[PDB]
């Protein structure tokens, strides 16, 4: 987690694998899924 390189296309597509990964909420930033850690 903590900014994974997957290259997003929007914040709802980041959400789905970042929340399965183990992070909290999702939020794309600079074409990269950034997420909030614990």
Swiss-Prot record:
Which Gene3D superfamilies does its entry note?
A: Knottin, scorpion toxin-like
Alphabetical keyword list: Disulfide bond, Ion channel impairing toxin, Neurotoxin, Potassium channel impairing toxin, Secreted, Toxin, Voltage-gated potassium channel impairing toxin
Organs and tissues of expression: Expressed by the venom gland.
Q: Which PROSITE patterns match?
A: SCORP_SHORT_TOXIN
Q: Name one GO molecular function term.
A: ion channel inhibitor activity
Q: Does the keyword ATP-binding apply?
A: no
Q: Which GO terms describe its cellular component?
A: extracellular region
For region Interaction with Ca(2+)-activated K(+) channels, the annotated ranges are: 26-33
Q: Which cysteines are joined by disulfide bonds?
A: 8-28, 14-33, 18-35
Q: Where is it located?
A: Secreted
**What SUPFAM superfamilies does the database record attribute to this sequence?**
Scorpion toxin-like
**Signal sequence coordinates:** none
Against InterPro entries, the record matches this protein to:
Scorpion_toxin-like_sf, Scorpion_toxinS_K_inh
Say what the protein does. Potent inhibitor voltage-gated potassium channels Kv1.3/KCNA3 (Kd=0.65 nM) and Kv1.1/KCNA1 (Kd=41 nM). It appears to block channel activity by a simple bimolecular inhibition process. Induces a transient period of fast flickering in the channel openings, followed by an almost complete blockade of the channel. Its binding affinity to rat brain synaptosomes is 5-fold higher than this of KTX-3. Binding of the toxin to the channel is associated with significant structural rearrangements in both molecules.
Miscellaneous comment: Negative results: shows weak inhibition of large conductance calcium-activated potassium channels (KCa1.1/KCNMA1) (Ki=1560 nM). Shows weak or no inhibition on Kv1.2/KCNA2. Shows no effect on Kv1.5/KCNA5 and Kv3.1/KCNC1.
Q: Of which family is this protein a member?
A: Belongs to the short scorpion toxin superfamily. Potassium channel inhibitor family. Alpha-KTx 03 subfamily.
Domain topic, free-text comment: Has the structural arrangement of an alpha-helix connected to a beta-sheet by disulfide bonds (CSalpha/beta).
How is this protein named in the record? Potassium channel toxin alpha-KTx 3.1
């Amino acid at each position: 987690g903590v900014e994974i390189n997957v290259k997003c296309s929007g914040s709802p597509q980041c959400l789905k694998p970042c929340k399965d990964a183990g992070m909290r909420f999702g939020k794309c930033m600079n074409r990269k899924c950034h997420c909030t850690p614990k």
